[PDB]
Amino acid sequence: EAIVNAQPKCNPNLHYWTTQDEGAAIGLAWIPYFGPAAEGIYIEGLMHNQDGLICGLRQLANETTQALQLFLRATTELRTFSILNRKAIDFLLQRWGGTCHILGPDCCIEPADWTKNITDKIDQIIHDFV
Amino acid sequence: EAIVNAQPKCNPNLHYWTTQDEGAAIGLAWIPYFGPAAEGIYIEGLMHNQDGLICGLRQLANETTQALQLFLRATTELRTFSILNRKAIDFLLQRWGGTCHILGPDCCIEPADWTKNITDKIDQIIHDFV
Amino acid sequence: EAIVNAQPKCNPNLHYWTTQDEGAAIGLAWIPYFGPAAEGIYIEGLMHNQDGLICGLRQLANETTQALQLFLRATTELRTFSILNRKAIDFLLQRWGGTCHILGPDCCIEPADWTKNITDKIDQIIHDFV
Ligand SMILES: *[C@@H]1O[C@H](CO)[C@@H](O[C@@H]2O[C@H](CO)[C@@H](O[C@@H]3O[C@H](CO[C@H]4O[C@H](CO)[C@@H](O)[C@H](O)[C@@H]4O)[C@@H](O)[C@H](O)[C@@H]3O)[C@H](O)[C@H]2NC(C)=O)[C@H](O)[C@H]1NC(C)=O
Ligand SMILES: *[C@@H]1O[C@H](CO)[C@@H](O[C@@H]2O[C@H](CO)[C@@H](O[C@@H]3O[C@H](CO[C@H]4O[C@H](CO)[C@@H](O)[C@H](O)[C@@H]4O)[C@@H](O)[C@H](O)[C@@H]3O)[C@H](O)[C@H]2NC(C)=O)[C@H](O)[C@H]1NC(C)=O
Ligand SMILES: *[C@@H]1O[C@H](CO)[C@@H](O[C@@H]2O[C@H](CO)[C@@H](O[C@@H]3O[C@H](CO[C@H]4O[C@H](CO)[C@@H](O)[C@H](O)[C@@H]4O)[C@@H](O)[C@H](O)[C@@H]3O)[C@H](O)[C@H]2NC(C)=O)[C@H](O)[C@H]1NC(C)=O
Ligand SMILES: CSc1ccc2c(c1)N(CC[C@H]1CCCCN1C)c1ccccc1S2
Ligand SMILES: CSc1ccc2c(c1)N(CC[C@H]1CCCCN1C)c1ccccc1S2
Ligand SMILES: CSc1ccc2c(c1)N(CC[C@H]1CCCCN1C)c1ccccc1S2
Known part of the structure; x- marks a missing residue:
């Protein structure tokens, strides 16, 4: 579904704050007592x-609220x-929660490179004919 | 393992209550202040x-308690x-926690439709012989 | 990355305590009131x-702290x-978070036994020639 910003205004820039899960600690700065x-x-x-x-994001957060x-x-x-x-678990269950029928639409298995590993290796049983 | 109800009685009907994660909100009913x-x-x-x-379920809950x-x-x-x-994570690890050996008993990969995509495409290298 | 113990000493034995998630309960010992x-x-x-x-483990816990x-x-x-x-979820996403390109380095799919199921079944279309 497309996101269409329907707000009176949009601040087009996002000055953000966050934390870093594991910032490259400088010396002992990682020790709670010293940090x-x-x-x-x-x-x-x-x-x-x-x-x-940014405008899409503001609209998405708005629409997510309900x-x-x-x-x-x-x-x-x-x-x-x-x-x-x-959501990570649901991402996995949607793809791998059932049997993966190869070349089916809900099976995320690419046999490409390797169909060229058997169709390319037929000339080892047909072209090798003696 | 089979579930065998071993209770003195069974209420065979289940009048249940639950919540709906995202009931199709009517108007503003989704806003906590108004809802x-x-x-x-x-x-x-x-x-x-x-x-x-229902009788199986009553027995299952009973047996689950220990x-x-x-x-x-x-x-x-x-x-x-x-x-x-x-349990969802364990469902995934049991199936995809190791290497999936195709046509093995613990590999939930069906190559059916697509074995008929290569065995059916042999008549493009054998029957095409000129 | 290798774990190299860099501590002044190592207690080489680990006398540990833990809990058992579901110890084979003896009688009613599983009932909180009696247990x-x-x-x-x-x-x-x-x-x-x-x-x-054990010495590796002591070093690992030390190094994990930052x-x-x-x-x-x-x-x-x-x-x-x-x-x-x-970490369990991340284990799964690293392997199955994208399309699994068979025989690629990041695709944990073994088609071994079963390449011998089609290359072995060629003598049912080539050797069967009449
Ligand atoms: C997501 O974005 C939406 C769009 O910006 C937000 O919609 C807002 O929703 C609230 C109610 O939840 C509305 O407040 C109501 O406004 C009406 C009318 O206000 C004045 O404007 C009309 C013309 O439209 C005028 O004719 C009237 O006479 C009013 O002077 C009030 O009658 C209500 O009591 C109520 O206050 C907002 O107006 C509405 N904004 C817009 C731009 O439509 C929505 O709230 C956002 N969601 C979250 C979670 O923030
Ligand atoms: C899951 O379902 C099980 C089957 O319904 C439940 O089993 C119950 O377990 C409790 C103990 O945990 C038992 O209570 C005991 O009862 C005996 C004897 O009670 C009377 O009955 C005998 C004949 O069986 C009679 O000869 C005696 O003289 C007694 O008059 C008491 O001596 C004990 O002190 C204790 O109270 C229940 O009897 C038992 N029910 C059944 C139908 O066997 C189990 O509790 C369920 N689990 C959960 C978590 O609810
Ligand atoms: C993981 O293992 C590491 C190795 O065992 C631990 O390293 C320890 O880190 C603390 C600081 O975080 C150090 O304490 C400092 O020690 C210095 C010097 O102490 C004395 O020794 C020197 C010779 O090395 C001597 O010349 C000095 O004059 C001192 O008499 C003090 O100046 C500091 O103020 C501070 O106290 C430990 O020394 C250090 N241990 C080792 C063996 O290097 C690390 O702490 C472990 N991590 C966790 C989370 O436990
Ligand atoms: C569906 S993923 C998505 C959706 C919207 C945006 C972006 C990614 N990214 C980076 C994500 C950003 C989001 C906010 C917190 C800090 N992080 C880095 C971005 C990069 C540069 C300009 C604008 C944007 S908005
Ligand atoms: C192993 S999955 C399982 C096991 C037992 C039952 C059922 C599914 N379902 C629906 C699940 C039901 C369970 C309780 C809460 C509300 N939801 C809908 C059912 C449908 C119709 C009559 C009886 C039952 S009992
Ligand atoms: C990367 S997995 C890993 C890493 C280090 C060790 C071991 C496994 N195991 C068993 C795990 C053990 C760990 C502590 C709590 C109780 N459990 C059984 C072990 C067996 C016998 C002697 C030493 C060790 S240390």
């Missing part, structure tokens, strides 16, 4: 609207950390 | 004992939400 | 330094239980 305080663990970056990604709110309504977990892990 | 209170988020349904599923209690004894999590996700 | 208290749920064992595993501390710094979860599950 940064809560305020100083953030990195920043600036992204522009190439391919319209399903996210409904998901939160139905869970009894107080804080939910597992959405991305569950 | 139902805790008591009003439930859907209901009624299932009968076709194939003996292993579930022992699992809970050994975890330090206060509330456990991850059992089904872990 | 062991927190102190009595542990099993023990003793492992020696065969293959240098990345583990940095991971903990960047999470907002108060208690983290999901590291091993996430």
Whole structure:
């Protein structure tokens, strides 16, 4: 489904903050006792609207809210950390949750290079005829 | 292993309640501020004992308790939400956790349709003989 | 990467404690009301330094701390239980997260036994010639 920004405005640039899971620690800075305080663990970056990604992203987050709110309504977990892990699992189950019928539309198996390994090796049983 | 109900009685019908992860929201009902209170988020349904599923299910839950209690004894999590996700992961690891030896018993790869794509395409190298 | 113990000493034996997820319960011992208290749920064992595993293990845990501390710094979860599950998911995504190109280096599909099922069944179309 296409994402069409339907907001009164779009800030086309995204000045973001995040954390780094394992920033190349400098010396002992990784030791909690010596390291940064809560305020100083953030990195920043600036992204522009190439391919319209920023305006699309603002619209996507907006459109995500209904399903996210409904998901939160139905869970009894107080804080939910597992959405991305569950999506990773669902990505795998959609592809590998059943028998992979080769050359079927729902089987992500490419036998290309290797059909050329047997059809190319027929001239070792037909052309080798003596 | 077969499930054999060994209870003094069986209620053969299951009047159930659950939640819907993303019920087709009507208007603004999905907004927590406007939506139902805790008591009003439930859907209901009624299932009968076709194939003996209800009596089997009551027995299954009964038999599950020992292993579930022992699992809970050994975890330090206060509330456990991850059992089904872990079972999904284990489903995948059992099938795809090693090398898939095609036509082996533990490899869920069907090369059927496509063995008929090469054995059917031999008459393009043997019957085409000129 | 090789693990080289660089500690002042190594205790070469590991007297360990753990829990058993589902110990073969004896009678009603699995019922929380009747079962062991927190102190009595542990099993023990003793492992020696065969293959240098114990000294390697002490070094591995030591070397793991930087990345583990940095991971903990960047999470907002108060208690983290999901590291091993996430590693299991990542194990699967590395192998099955894309299209599996058979006989490619990142495709864990063995067509061995079964290339001998078609190359062995050529003498049913070539040697059967009449
Ligand atoms: C995702 O993006 C959507 C588009 O920006 C957001 O839609 C907003 O939704 C709220 C309600 O949830 C609307 O607020 C209502 O506004 C009406 C009318 O407001 C004035 O404007 C009309 C002309 O449209 C005018 O004729 C009226 O007389 C009002 O003066 C109020 O009557 C309601 O009580 C209510 O306040 C927003 O207007 C609406 N925005 C737009 C641009 O349509 C949506 O909220 C976003 N989702 C999230 C989760 O943020
Ligand atoms: C799963 O289903 C099982 C089958 O319904 C449940 O088994 C129940 O287990 C409890 C103990 O955990 C038993 O309670 C005991 O009962 C005996 C005897 O009770 C009376 O009956 C005998 C005849 O059988 C009679 O001769 C006696 O004199 C008694 O008058 C008591 O002595 C014990 O102290 C204890 O209370 C249940 O009897 C038993 N039910 C059945 C139908 O066997 C099991 O509990 C279920 N699991 C869960 C987790 O719910
Ligand atoms: C993983 O294993 C590593 C190797 O065992 C551990 O390395 C330890 O790291 C701490 C700091 O994080 C060091 O403590 C420092 O020690 C120096 C010097 O101590 C004395 O020794 C030198 C000779 O090396 C001597 O010349 C000095 O005058 C000192 O008398 C202090 O100056 C610092 O203030 C600080 O205390 C350990 O020395 C170091 N151990 C070794 C064997 O190198 C590492 O800690 C382990 N990681 C975890 C998470 O446990
Ligand atoms: C469906 S994946 C997707 C969707 C939208 C955008 C992008 C990727 N990326 C990078 C992701 C970015 C997202 C926000 C947090 C920091 N990270 C790096 C980007 C790169 C350059 C300009 C704009 C954008 S927006
Ligand atoms: C091993 S999967 C399994 C095992 C037992 C039953 C069923 C599936 N289903 C539907 C599942 C049902 C379970 C309870 C919560 C609501 N959902 C829909 C069923 C359908 C119709 C009559 C009886 C049953 S019992
Ligand atoms: C990369 S997997 C790995 C790495 C190091 C060791 C081992 C496996 N095993 C068994 C695992 C053991 C680990 C500690 C908790 C209890 N369990 C059984 C072992 C067997 C016998 C002697 C030494 C060792 S150390």
